[PDB]
Design an enzyme around this catalytic site. Structure first.
Site, short mmCIF file in Angstrom:
data_model
loop_
_atom_site.label_atom_id
_atom_site.label_comp_id
_atom_site.label_asym_id
_atom_site.label_seq_id
_atom_site.Cartn_x
_atom_site.Cartn_y
_atom_site.Cartn_z
N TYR A 124 0.83 -1.20 0.00
CA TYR A 124 0.00 0.00 0.00
C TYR A 124 0.85 1.23 0.00
O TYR A 124 0.48 2.25 -0.63
CB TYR A 124 -0.98 0.01 1.15
CG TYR A 124 -1.89 -1.18 1.22
CD1 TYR A 124 -2.77 -1.46 0.18
CD2 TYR A 124 -1.87 -2.01 2.33
CE1 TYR A 124 -3.61 -2.55 0.22
CE2 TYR A 124 -2.71 -3.11 2.36
CZ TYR A 124 -3.58 -3.39 1.33
OH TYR A 124 -4.39 -4.49 1.41
N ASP B 143 -3.69 -14.31 -1.21
CA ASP B 143 -3.27 -14.52 0.18
C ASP B 143 -4.49 -14.55 1.09
O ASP B 143 -4.61 -15.39 2.00
CB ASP B 143 -2.30 -13.41 0.66
CG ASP B 143 -0.94 -13.43 -0.07
OD1 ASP B 143 -0.54 -14.51 -0.56
OD2 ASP B 143 -0.28 -12.37 -0.15
#
EC number: 1.17.4.1
Lengths: 349, 349
Positions: free
Chosen positions: B122, B237
């Protein structure tokens, strides 16, 4: 004083464009100005029918648009429909009774006709993308923003038509109508005409091109592609129309056609400048209305306003007026893709 | 009462998942539950680094977005960063001191680690699309809407951690702390854990998937494609993580692992139901915040809320709870393109 067939055998090669002897025999073996014959031939070769274009997919795209993007698209659609509702009837009603050379007379009829194809094409689009077309068509009349532009644009036509009727009916001079003074001046009437044409030039060369940008911006996002196919054809026509008025205006002010017009054109060269600027600003304020609820990828209030100044500067120089805006390059160069034609220069140069 | 190396030679095949003897020797030749060993192996094979992905073009797309579309994208980005800022540290801090089988212990560390890759990714995205990243990172803490979800989610962790510390320090019973009564109940502590896991399951299996939809919706418009490449890896994930908690929860309530947990899980089966529903509703109200200034092609408050109900129903049945919403099919079937992997089922089934 108007006759659908004047009985005098005049030399149509030596008649003025306007206010001369009404055209008797429609002949096309000779012209005073061959530009109008060239426009007619071009316009005829361009002839298209709206329904040739599949706009089915556009219904799906429209429904999928966010509300504010719907607002943008339909507001623009409604404005175009209004402009060419006027362009459909007005060149005929206002200019025909004043034209005195055949090639100009036919060009105007061909021009107005081609506008009726445009109006029909909007009905094709509207019926296909909304459930109840009446809502859209009714908004065109009662929408406060659209209504403002209609009133201004239609007044240049209306004042010319009304003054024309007095002229045909009363001839030049000072008259008594129901105990009121009505002064008919050919000089004044010539002025109403010049301003009207300037106004119409702005309509077609600027107002509509501002609208084309909104349409093609959708097409750039690969949306409303049927609509854009149609706008391409409309734009190709529009380039002929604006060329028409650019030559009428330029021939009138050059004094080549009528020496009194050259004087009148200089007398109100300021008025025409102001006229254009008022149009450019009205289109900027329109940009505000379109994007009041948000913009979309590739087009917003700022960008469109730059295009208005850009396009305005170009059209104004083409009719010998002073540029009102800073010299700027093209803010949306992608639009020239869509403003193309191998037979006429659609894109402004 | 906690030791980083318990000196007793226990049979780790017969230890409970939680609250048993702290893990001494980390061994992977044998498991009680091989799902956690399978998750570890999967997660390790999935290992990726954020900078592998070119997000350069995304800066251009971002700048070109209308303000409200910027609002959508960045609000979503900020929410994800918050969620995995928590997921980065919290599984380790809250669950490690309670785990008593090695395979679960390693899975949690592997899980938390993989979250730190997410948080780093991010930062990669943010630095690349805005001028001053501090504004974004600072908003994550002070944003009223984000802050609300942070407080609720972090409380399930915090209450578990605090009650854990009392338990390690005081052991079970009734105690005197600065003249106050502190009652330590393993039964209560077991409950705090069960609810925390339910909460974390909602976080990863629902909250994040709601967020993935917003991201991929941009990618469907061929915008922010670098971001979407990254979200694909994060989502792959996330499917491992939610599978992890689904098995902890299901093994706990089945009574297979610990019989007292099965009772406790039924005692608060209503509380967990309510928990999930509170999460589903919070995500619906979040949809409201995202689209307060308008929506975009393919995603809006209505559509996203349908996906919330859809996805919520699926996750809840997977952990043996009653469906709170009308049975509905998938409102955005295009999302399953993006939720794909040949090694694990990312897309909810």
């Amino acid at each position: 004083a108007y006759t659908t067939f004047s009985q005098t055998k005049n030399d149509q090669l030596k008649e003025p464009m306007f206010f001369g002897q009404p055209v008797n025999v429609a002949r096309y073996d000779q012209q005073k100005y061959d530009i109008f014959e060239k426009l007619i031939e071009k316009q005829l070769s361009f002839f298209w029918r709206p329904e040739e274009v599949d706009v089915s997919r556009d219904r799906i795209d429209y429904q999928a648009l966010p509300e504010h993007e719907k607002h943008i698209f339909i507001s623009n659609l409604k404005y175009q429909t209004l402009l060419d509702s006027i362009q459909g009837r007005s060149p005929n009603v206002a200019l025909l009774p004043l034209i005195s050379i055949p090639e100009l007379e036919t060009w105007v009829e061909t021009w107005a006709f081609s506008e009726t194809i445009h109006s029909r094409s909007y009905t094709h689009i509207i019926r296909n993308i909304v459930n109840d077309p009446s809502v859209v068509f009714d908004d065109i009349v009662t929408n406060e923003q659209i209504q403002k532009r209609a009133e201004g644009i239609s007044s240049y036509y209306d004042e010319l038509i009304e003054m024309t009727s007095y002229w045909h009916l009363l001839g030049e001079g000072t008259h008594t109508v129901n105990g009121k003074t009505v002064t008919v001046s050919l000089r004044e009437l010539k002025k109403k005409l010049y301003l009207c044409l300037m106004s119409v030039n702005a309509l077609e060369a600027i107002r509509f091109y501002v609208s084309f940008a909104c349409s093609f911006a959708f097409a750039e996002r690969e949306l409303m592609e049927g609509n854009a196919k149609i706008i391409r054809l409309i734009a190709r026509d529009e380039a002929l129309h604006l060329t028409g008025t650019q030559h009428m205006l330029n021939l009138l002010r050059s004094g080549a056609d009528d020496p009194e017009m050259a004087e009148i054109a200089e007398e109100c060269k300021q008025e025409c400048y102001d006229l254009f600027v008022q149009a450019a600003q009205q289109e900027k304020d329109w940009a505000d209305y379109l994007f009041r609820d948000g913009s979309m990828i590739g087009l917003n209030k700022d960008i469109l306003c730059q295009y208005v100044e850009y396009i305005t500067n170009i059209r104004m120089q083409a009719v010998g007026l002073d540029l009102p805006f800073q010299t700027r390059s093209n803010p949306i160069p992608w639009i020239n893709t869509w403003l193309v034609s191998d037979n006429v220069q659609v894109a402004p140069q």
